[PDB]
Amino acid sequence: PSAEEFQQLRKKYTDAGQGHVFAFVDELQTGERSQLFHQLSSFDPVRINELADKALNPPASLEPLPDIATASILDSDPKDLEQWYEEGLKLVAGNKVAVVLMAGGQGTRLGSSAPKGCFDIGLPSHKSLFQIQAERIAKLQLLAQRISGKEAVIPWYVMTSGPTRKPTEEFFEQHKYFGLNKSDVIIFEQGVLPCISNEGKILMESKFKVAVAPDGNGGIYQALLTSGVREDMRKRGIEHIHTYCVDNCLVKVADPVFIGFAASKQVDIATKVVRKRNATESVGLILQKNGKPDVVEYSEIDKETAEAKDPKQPDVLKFRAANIVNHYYSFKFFESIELWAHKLPHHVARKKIPCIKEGTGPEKPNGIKLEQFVFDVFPMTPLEKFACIEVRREDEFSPLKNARGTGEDDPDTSKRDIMSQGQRWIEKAGGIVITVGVEVSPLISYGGEGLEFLKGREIKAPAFIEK
């Protein structure tokens, strides 16, 4: 980079009051100077000031969603469920369904060196989360081809962060994309934002590098633009998109009932909830805020509304629609990302951020991280174009939040929930499990179907059913 270019960027950053980022320029080699220039050129210091000022010196009517925006697998006529299943499989057969996997962030509570998706929860098969999810996609394609006689393709768009992108790609490569076609799997990367000190200043990770952090799972939308994923969806004729979080080992990827329901109700956005397990559960709550669909994140709710009770049922929580990060979107919505993505607010968390001030190294929080949330598009959705669908936790939601030996939301509960699901399915089909649980490969059964061959047979738990 030329001296005139470098000087123009230094004036920009200095005039914006961020001139410290050049404080160690005189000590840098050419490579380190080149890095700093390119990194700093990717941010607008003035925009950073505006974000910092909103975050650091910042400036509601809550009810449960109305019954016209809600649904429940429990209250559902089994004929509707069967019809929605069939229409969902028809949409897969028409190559109209895509999956976006949010596999970014860090996964800091589990404390793994690898991307969370790689984690092996200890099933008999030792499949990772990624592989279980990939095989559900493959199975669903197989089921769809049974009705169409033609190839069925659910493209898998896998969003990672800067940190996790390279280990994610190597892993997929080493597993040959889990039997999927690499041309139908796109790994891409969310954006970053610089970390901001408590005094509003950009934090320097090193003498030549700014401390950045991923911009939240709400960064998914803009990243679909700049990565070309949205254009790939358009080329393929995608009309229905399922987005989910990688940490849930029970996730029904591209759930045909969910998608069939959303498409058939012609909603623009849909989302799955489970009954909140208690008042302190670390889950966003889905509700009606100032007349619109909305979510209150567990990190921003007050003890008041989290503890609020149903007027008629004094021991049930008034707000209990727990977000399980399972969203439906009509493709039409993604066509206007340019119009609304920059409207998504920036949520603030105080962080201890390793940085340099004459050498690297922070006891108490020295700055903040900014994040957009994926559910903050819900207030953009008309109530009659929104569906909040209750599902069964024990079939649909088993998150890996914590390291082993926590007690909940950890690898042991994940493994327990998967193998209880398998046993229950096998028992429904007439099999006898002896004994815990049974792992059922997604390639054998996506959601309980195709287990007739186990009828009358005895299975000694633990067991593993594959091809």
Ligand X SMILES: CC(=O)N[C@H]1[C@@H](OP(=O)(O)O)O[C@H](CO)[C@@H](O)[C@@H]1O
Ligand Y SMILES: N[C@@H](CC(=O)O)c1cccs1
Ligand Z SMILES: CCc1c(C)nn(C)c1N
Q: Binding site membership for Mg(2+): which residues?
A: 67, 70
Binding at 275: pick from ligand X, ligand Y, ligand Z, none (beta carbon under 5-8 Å per type): none
Place of tokens 């006891």: 363
By the criterion CB under 6 A, which residues form the site for ligand Y? 299, 347-349, 369, 371
Task: Report the C-alpha gap between 198 and 208 in whole angstroms.
Answer: 21
Show binding-site residues: 67, 70
CB of 381 to ligand Z, least distance (A): 4
By the criterion CB under 6 A, which residues form the site for ligand Z? 268-269, 330, 332-333, 336, 340, 380-381, 385
Tell me how far the alpha carbon of residue 77 is from its chain's centroid. 30
Closer to ligand X at the Cβ: 121 or 454? 121
Residue 165 three-state SS: helix
Closer to ligand Y at the Cβ: 109 or 209? 109
Binding at 380: pick from ligand X, ligand Y, ligand Z, none (beta carbon under 5-8 Å per type): ligand Z
Tell me the C-alpha to C-alpha distance, in Å, between residue 96 and each of 130, 144, 149, 242.
22, 12, 16, 11
By the criterion CB under 6 A, which residues form the site for ligand X? 217, 245, 283-284, 297, 322-325, 373-374, 399, 401
Q: Report the residue number whose CB is nearest to ligand X.
A: 284
Q: What is the DSSP letter of 333?
A: H
Closer to ligand X at the Cβ: 401 or 416? 401
Q: What's the token pair of residue 168?
A: 């994610």
> 291-296: which pairs have CB atoms within 8 A and are 24 or more residues apart?
291/61, 291/383, 292/378, 292/379, 292/381, 292/383, 293/65, 293/69, 293/269, 293/378, 293/379, 293/381, 293/383, 293/386, 293/388, 294/378, 294/379, 295/323, 295/373, 295/375, 295/376, 295/378, 296/62
Binding at 348: pick from ligand Y, ligand X, ligand Z, none (beta carbon under 5-8 Å per type): ligand Y
Task: Report the C-alpha gap between 329 and 100 in whole angstroms.
Answer: 11
Binding at 349: pick from ligand X, ligand Z, ligand Y, none (beta carbon under 5-8 Å per type): ligand Y
Task: Report the C-alpha gap between 397 and 239 in whole angstroms.
Answer: 25
CB of 371 to ligand X, least distance (A): 7
Closer to ligand Y at the Cβ: 348 or 388? 348
Distance from the first to the final alpha carbon of the chain:
57
CB of 131 to ligand X, least distance (A): 21
Closer to ligand Z at the Cβ: 8 or 266? 266
Closer to ligand Z at the Cβ: 180 or 270? 270
Binding at 325: pick from ligand Y, ligand Z, ligand X, none (beta carbon under 5-8 Å per type): ligand X
